[PDB]
Amino acid sequence: MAKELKFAEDARAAMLRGVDKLADTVKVTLGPKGRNVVLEKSYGSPLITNDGVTIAKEIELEDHFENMGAKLVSEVASKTNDIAGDGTTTATVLTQAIVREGLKNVTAGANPLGIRRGIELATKAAVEELHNISTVVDSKEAIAQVAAVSSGSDKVGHLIADAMEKVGNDGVITIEESKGIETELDVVEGMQFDRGYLSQYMVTDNDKMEAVLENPYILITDKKISNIQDILPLLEQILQQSRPLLIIADDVDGEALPTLVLNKIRGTFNVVAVKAPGFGDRRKAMLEDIAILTGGTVITDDLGLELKDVTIENLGNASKVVVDKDNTTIVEGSGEKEAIEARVQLIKNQIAETTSDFDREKLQERLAKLAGGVAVVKVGAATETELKELKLRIEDALNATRAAVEEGMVSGGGTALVNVISKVSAVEAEGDVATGIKIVVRALEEPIRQIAENAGYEGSVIVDKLKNVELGTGFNAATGEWVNMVEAGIVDPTKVTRSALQNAASVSALLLTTEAVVADKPEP
Amino acid sequence: MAKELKFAEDARAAMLRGVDKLADTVKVTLGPKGRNVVLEKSYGSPLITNDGVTIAKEIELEDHFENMGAKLVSEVASKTNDIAGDGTTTATVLTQAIVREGLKNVTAGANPLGIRRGIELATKAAVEELHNISTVVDSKEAIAQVAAVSSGSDKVGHLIADAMEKVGNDGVITIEESKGIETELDVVEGMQFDRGYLSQYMVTDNDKMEAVLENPYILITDKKISNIQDILPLLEQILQQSRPLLIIADDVDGEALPTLVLNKIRGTFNVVAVKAPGFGDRRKAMLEDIAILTGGTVITDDLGLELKDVTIENLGNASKVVVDKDNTTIVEGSGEKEAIEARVQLIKNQIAETTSDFDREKLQERLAKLAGGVAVVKVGAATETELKELKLRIEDALNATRAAVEEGMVSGGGTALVNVISKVSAVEAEGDVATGIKIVVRALEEPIRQIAENAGYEGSVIVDKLKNVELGTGFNAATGEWVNMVEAGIVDPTKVTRSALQNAASVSALLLTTEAVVADKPEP
Amino acid sequence: MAKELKFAEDARAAMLRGVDKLADTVKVTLGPKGRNVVLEKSYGSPLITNDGVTIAKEIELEDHFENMGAKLVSEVASKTNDIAGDGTTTATVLTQAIVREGLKNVTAGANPLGIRRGIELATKAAVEELHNISTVVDSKEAIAQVAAVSSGSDKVGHLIADAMEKVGNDGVITIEESKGIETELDVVEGMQFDRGYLSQYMVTDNDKMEAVLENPYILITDKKISNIQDILPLLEQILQQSRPLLIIADDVDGEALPTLVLNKIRGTFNVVAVKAPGFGDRRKAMLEDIAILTGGTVITDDLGLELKDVTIENLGNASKVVVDKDNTTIVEGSGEKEAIEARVQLIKNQIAETTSDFDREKLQERLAKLAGGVAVVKVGAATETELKELKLRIEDALNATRAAVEEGMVSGGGTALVNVISKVSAVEAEGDVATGIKIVVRALEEPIRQIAENAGYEGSVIVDKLKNVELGTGFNAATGEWVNMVEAGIVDPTKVTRSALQNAASVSALLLTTEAVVADKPEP
After folding, report:
1. Exposed, middle or buried, B213 (CB in 10 Å: 0-12/13-18/19+)?
2. B316 is in an annotated binding site
3. DSSP B180-191
4. Chain B, 176-205: which have a CB under 8 Å from a chain A CB?
5. In terms of DSSP bridges, do strands C328-333 and C374-379 run parallel, antiparallel, or are they unpaired?
6. d(Cα B95, Cα B76) in Å, to the nearest integer?
7. CA A95 to chain CA centroid, nearest Å
8. B61 CB contacts (<8 Å, ≥6 apart)?
C-alpha cells in the first residue's frame, strides 16, 4: 500500500520524537525511587506498575514514524532484558540522550560517519574500562552473598551456592515446586542442550515461554520427519498412554509439523518436537548419549529402525522435560546408571586419546553435560502464593548469580558509568570523531542524573560531586547519603551495564546514519 | 477505470518527480560508505538496510504518475541486479541525472529525437571505450585472486579456480551443504539445459526462486502433455513411492498443468514440469542424452511408448535436480557410465563427420554439456548459521567470478566511468546530437560525485582531481586517499558497469520521447 | 517604505511577463498591414491608433514587476523613436524574442555571462554586415528621390534637395508656415548651436517640445546669472516692449531660474534662458559671433559691462528663435551683414593660420555655422488643415532624408535583418557563446515573421522562402508578392534598423544578467 517516503532531517525529526516519547514514558521508573506508570487494559482493572520492560512492550504510537522509533528502541531493550530486569531501561535512556545530542550536532554539519566512528571508539574504551575496574566474583562465599544480597532472601544464597558447586559453573540448575513446606536441593541425571522448540504454539507455560512436560515419552532419531504418516502408529500408542511426547529429530517440517501444531492446540497431543543437537557424525554422539540417559533408542538408518516401526519401548523416558526458546532440558532420565557410566568412561577414554583440541573440547562438553547432572531445587512453602513468590524470587536470583559469576560485580546505581568517564575522555581523536567522543562523555551521565532527579535531588549537583569523590563511593538515591555502594549493597552486574551500553551505542550509531525513511501512509 | 489523459510537459514533470523520489530513496546507499534506509514492515520490527535492490522493490507511490516512474525505474534495475548486487543502483542514479538534464534542455526547445540520437551515440562510444580499457581476467591465478576478493574468504578462490578448470569456462558449478565441517569440491555426471519451470507455483525455494528436488523421478518424453489422464497411473505410482517427479516434455498445458499446480500447492505431489530443450530432430538428441544420463527412457511415438504405459522403471533418476526460472540442472544422473561414454563417442564421431559449422557447433554443445560434468561444492561448517553465511558468500563470489571471466575487470567506485569521459567528449556531433553528448558527459560523473558526497567529501573537488590524475588511480571513499584501485582492490566487473550504463541510457531515451501519459484516475 | 525582495527565476518570470504584455500590445501594429489598437482616454472618445510609440507610452501595469518590465522596454524605445517613427517597435519585438529564448536557455544551465557575450558578438557582427550591404545615398538625385519616396509629397523632394545643397548636408534647415498658398524655400543668416532649454516649463510648443520665439530680444553674456536682481531693469524694459527675450549665459540657476520659470508660467514674460556654447576662451568666440549675427553685444567682465547695466540696445535681435531640448536655433539675426562677413574672413584667416587640427576643426565648425546660413521652408497652402498636414509631412520627410544621407538605404520590411543572418551564423563560438549566437540568429526572424502574420500569411513559409531568394528581393506584405523592395519602394533607413538592433541587444543583455529585483510592495 502507498508509501510516504521522507528524507533529510524531518524523517530524523520524527525518529527523535518517537524515541523521546518512549523514553519519557520509560525513564521515570528508573532507579530505586522510580515513580509509577499506569497502563490501560481492555478488560478488568487497569494495571499500575514501575516495571520498565512491560511499559515498553505496551507502547504503540499512532504516528507511523514515531511508532517506528518506539518499535526500534523496544527491540533494542529486548536484547538486554534477558539478563536481570533493569538493563532494559538504562539502554533506552542512553539511546535517547545520544540520539538527541547527535541529531543536534549533525544539524550543524558534523559528517555523521565521523560521529559514528567516535561513538564506537568511546563505547569500546568504556567497555574496556568497565572490564578493568570490577570486583571479580569467583569465591564461593562471595557468590553465596551476591545471590542472597540482591533479592535472594538468605537461604537461596546457600542453596544456589551448593548447587553451583555441585554442578559447576556451566552446570544445569532447575527449580521445582516441592509439595512440602521446605525448599530442597537435589542433583539428578539430566540433559540440557541448545535446541529450543520448533514453534511457539506448543509452549505449555506462556508466561515463562517454556514448554513443560511431566513424565513424557522421548522420541530420539537422526532422521528428518516431514510426513505425519511415519509416526501415526506411535502417535496412536502415545494417545492410548495419554502421556506427553518429546521428539528429537534432525528436522520436523512439511505436513507433520502443522499437523502436530494443530493437535497440540486442540489438546489432542501433548507433543513437543525439537531439532537434534550436533551435526554430522557428532550429532549421533549425543543422540546416543540421550538414548542412554533416557533409556530410549536412537531411530537411525544405520540400525535399520524405521519411524513407522518405533514402539513405546524404544522411546526415552524422563520425569520432566523443560523446553525454552533456545534450549531443551531433560530431568531424571530413565536410562540405566551403569550404561551412562560406561558412556562417560568411553568419552573420558576418547578425551585421553583424541589429539585435536577441537574434538577434545567437544568430547569434554559431552562429558561435562553427561556427568555434571542437573541441580533440582524443589521449592516448598506453606501457601501457593508463598510458593510462587519464592519461585519468582529464586529465578531472578539465579540469573543474577550466574551473571555475576561470568563477568563480575561493579558499583550499582549508575556509579560505574560515571567512574569510566575519565578514561573515555582520555581517548584521543579529532574532528567529528572527537565530537562523538564528547557526545558519549556527556551522555554517560544520564542514568545517575535521572535517578537523582526521580528522587527529587538536583542531578547536576550529584554528578559534579560524584566526579570528585573517591572511587567506590557513590550516591544512595534511597537515603540521599554518600556512602560506599559495595558496603551498602547497591551493586549491579557488570554484564548488564556493558550490554546496555553496547546495545545503546550500536543502535544510536545505526539511527544517526539514517538518511531516508520509507513508511506506510496512514489510510484515510 | 476512468483515465487521466495528460500531455505535454506536466506529464513529464510527474514522470520526473516519481523518478526523483525513487532516486533520492535509493542513491543514499551507493558506495562503501552508504547510509542506511529504514523500511516499514506489516509485522515484526522494521528492517534497516542499505541494500539498494530491496529498497527499490519496496517503493510504491500514491500518485499514479509517480508510481509509473517508480515502476519503470524498478523494471530497469531488474534487468541488471541479476549480475552482482550493485548494478541495480548506479543505473538508477544515471537515469535520474540524464532524465533531469534532458527534461531541462527539452523545455527550451532541443527536438527530443536529436537528444535521443546523441545519447545513443555517446553510450555506444562509452561502451566501446569500456571494452577498450580493461584488465582481461583469463589466467587461472587471476581468476582465483578475483574470486578470493568479493568476500569469498580465502578458500573460495581456490575452490572456484579448481572447479572452473575442471568443468571449463561454461561448465556447470553447483553449491551444496555438506553434512561435515569442511567444504569439498566434487565433479559428477550432471545435466543443465536452458529450460526453466513452467510456473512459479512449484518453486521449492522461494528466496532463491529455484525449484529443488532431491532424488526425484524424471519423466522424459517428446510428446505434448495436455491431459492429466495420460499420466494418472504414473502419478499414483510415484505417490506410492512418495518421491519427487521431474517432467521433461514438449509442452505441458491444458488441464494437466493446473491440476499439477494445484497438487503441488496442496503438497500432494512434488512434481516439476519443464519444456524439452531443442527443436525438431535436434530435440530428441539431448532427450536421448538425458535418458542415457539418468537411466530413463524417452517416451516417444517412434518407440511405441504411450504416456499411460509409462512405469517407474522407464523414469530417469538422479540425486538432485535444480530448476531455476530459465534453466534446469540435473545432478548425479543414475544412468550407466558406459552408456554415457558411448553416447559421447558417438557425438564425437558425428562432430568429426559433420560438415555444417552450425550442426558441428550444436553437436559440440551437446558433447561439452555431457562430458564436462557438474562441479559440486559441498559446503561444510560447524554451525548452520556458518553454513548459510558461507553458502551466500560463495554464491555471489561465483557470480562475480564468472562475470569477470567473461568480460574482464576494471576500476571500481565509478572510476572507470570518469576514465571514459574524454573519449565520449571526442565524439563529433552538431545541434541536438551534440547537446545529448554533453548531457551524457555531464551525467557520467554522478556515481563518483554521489559516492564522495555520501562519505562527506565535496563531490566537485573529487571529480576535478580525478579528471587530472593518472589512469588507474582513483579515490578511495573508505579512507579518503588517492591510491591505485587495482592495487587497493577497489575493482568492479566490466559487465556490471556496461550493463547499467546501457540500461540507463536506453530507458532515459525511451522516457525523453514521451508525449502523453495515460494513467488510471484515482477512485474517489 | 516596505520592499518585496525577490530573487532567482521568479523575478525573471515577472520581468518576462511584463515584457510579453507590452510586446503583445505593441507588435500587432508592426508592418504596413498592421492592425489597430484602442486606447482609453479620461475625457472624450477613446483614441484608436496603430502608432507604436503612443501605445507604448500609454501602457502602465498594476503589477509592480511587470510595470518595471514595461518601463524598461519603453525607455529602450525612447532612445530610438527620435529617428523616423518605426524603430520604436522593432526593438521591442526583438527584445521580447531574445528575452524569452534566453530565459528558457538559462533555466537549463547556460551561464548567463556566456549568453551575454554571445549576444554582443552576434550583434556586433550583424551591425558590421548591415554597414557592409547598403545602398549608399549621397547623390543629389538619390537624395531627392529618397525625400520624394515615403510620403514626401513630390515637391518636398526638390525643396529638400535645393535646401541641403545650399546649406550643405549638415546645414540647418527650418520649416515655416507661409501666409500664401505656395511653399517657398529661403536661405537666411541664422545660428543653431547644441544648447537646449534649461527647463521644460518655458516650452512654447508642447506637441513639438520646442520653444518658439517670434522677434525676440537676445541676451548675450558669458557671466553666470544666479540673481534675478541683476536683470530686473532689463526685464522691466522688455516687459514694456512686450517682446520675447532670449538669454544666452554661462549658467542660469539659483533664484533667478525659478523666478523666470514662474513668470513664464504666469505669462508675464516670454523669456527663455539657455547655456552658452563653448568653454574657456572658445566660448567667447561663438559668443562674439552670435553678437555680430544678431546685432547684440556680449556682456562680459572683460568689456566692463554689468548685467544690471544691460539696455535694450545691447540685446541681440532676430526674426525667430527655436529652442529644442538640446539645440537652440536662431533665424534671421539682425546683425550687420558686413560685420558677419568680417568675422567670417577673420575665422578663415585663423583657419589658414592655425596649426592644431583640433583648433582648425573648431574654427571650421564656427565658419560653417556662420556662413552656411539657415534654410527656411515657408510652407503655403489653401487651408490651415492643408498647411498643418504639409508641415507634418515635411518634418518626417526631412528627418528620414537626413537619416538616409548619413548612413544610407537598405531593404525595408525587415528584409535586411534576414539578409544578414548568414554572416551572423558564420561567427565561430563555443558553449554559451555559441548558444547566444543561435539565440540571436533565431530572434532576427521575428520582424518579418510578425509582419507576415499580421497580413494573414504564414510567417514560417515567408521566412523559409526569403532565406532562399536572391538578395534585394523580399516579401511585399501589402500585396503578398515577391518583388524587388528597392524597385517597389519598400526601403528603410540603415540607421533605424541598426539603432533598434543595438538597443534591443544591449537591453536584453542587461536584463538576462538580472539576479535580484527590489520593487515597492503594493499598499493594502
Report:
1. buried
2. no
3. SSS-EEEEE-EE
4. 179-181
5. unpaired
6. 9
7. 20
8. A2, A3, A5, B18, B21, B67, B69, B70
Question: A421: Cβ–Cβ under 8 A, 6 or more apart, which residues?
Answer: A441, A444, A445, A467
All cell numbers assigned to C431: 558553449
- CA C197 to CA C209: how far, in whole Å? 10
- Nearest-angstrom CA–CA distance, A508 and A503: 8
Q: Is B413 known as a binding-site position?
A: yes
The resolution, in angstroms to one decimal, equals 4.0
Are B384 and A279 within 8 A, CB to CB?
Answer: yes
Q: Using the beta-carbon criterion (under 8 Å), do B101 and C108 form an inter-chain contact?
A: yes
Residues of A in contact with B35 (CB under 8 A): 112, 513-515
CA atoms of C302 and B308, how far apart (whole Å): 141
Q: Which residues contact B158 (CB under 8 A, 6 or more apart)?
A: B144, B148
- Give B-chain residues touching C101 at CB under 8 angstroms: 108-109
Separation CA B128–CA C174 (nearest Å): 78
CA distance C27 to C30: 5
Chain B CB contacts of C105 below 8 Å: 108
Q: Helix/strand/coil (H, E, C) string of B301-336?
A: HHHCCCHHHCCCCCCEEEEEEEECCCCEEEEEECCC
Core vs surface per residue C295-317: b (16+ CB within 10 A) or e: bbbbbbeeeebebeebeeebbbb
Tell if the CB–CB gap between A279 and B24 is shorter than 8 Å: no
Residue B165 CB coordination number (10 Å): 14
Q: Is B492 annotated as a binding residue?
A: yes
Q: Is B476 annotated as a binding residue?
A: yes
The gap from C-alpha A263 to its chain's centroid, in whole angstroms, comes to 30
Spatial separation of the C-alpha atoms in residues A266 and A262, rounded to whole Å: 6
In terms of CA atoms, which chain B residue is nearest residue A250? Answer: B179
Quote the CA–CA distance of B202 and B204 in Å, as a whole number.
6
C-alpha to C-alpha distance for C410 and C492, rounded to whole angstroms: 6
Whether C and A touch, i.e. at least 3 CB pairs below 8 A, reads as no
Q: Tell me the shortest Cα–Cα distance from A398 to chain B, in angstroms.
A: 29
DSSP line for C74-126: HHHHHHHHTSSSSHHHHHHHHHHHHHHHHHHHHHT---HHHHHHHHHHHHHHH
Alpha carbon distance, N-terminus to C-terminus of chain A: 12
Chain C residue with Cα closest to B110: C105
What is the grid cell recorded at B390?
Answer: 558461507
| Shortest Cα–Cα distance, B264 to chain A (Å) | 13
Contact B104 C101 (CB under 8 A): no
Specify whether the CB–CB gap between A129 and A497 falls below 8 A.
no
Contact status, residue A37 vs residue A457, Cβ threshold 8 Å: no
Experimental method: cryo-EM
Q: Which is nearest to B483 in space by CA: B469, B495, B496? A: B469
Decide if C484 contacts C135 (C-beta within 8 A): no
CA B199, B201, B202, B206 torsion-angle sign: positive
Phi/psi region, residue A8 (left: phi>0; alpha: psi -120 to 50; beta: rest), is: left
Cα separations in angstroms, A342 against A303, A349, A366, A491, C180: 20, 10, 13, 45, 155
B428 and chain C in contact, CB less than 8 A: no
Buried b (16+ CB within 10 A) or exposed e, A72-111: bbbebbbbbbebbbbbbbbbbbbbbbbbbbbbebbeeebb
Enumerate the H helices of A305-411 as residue ranges: 337-353, 357-371, 384-406
Three-state SS at C185: strand
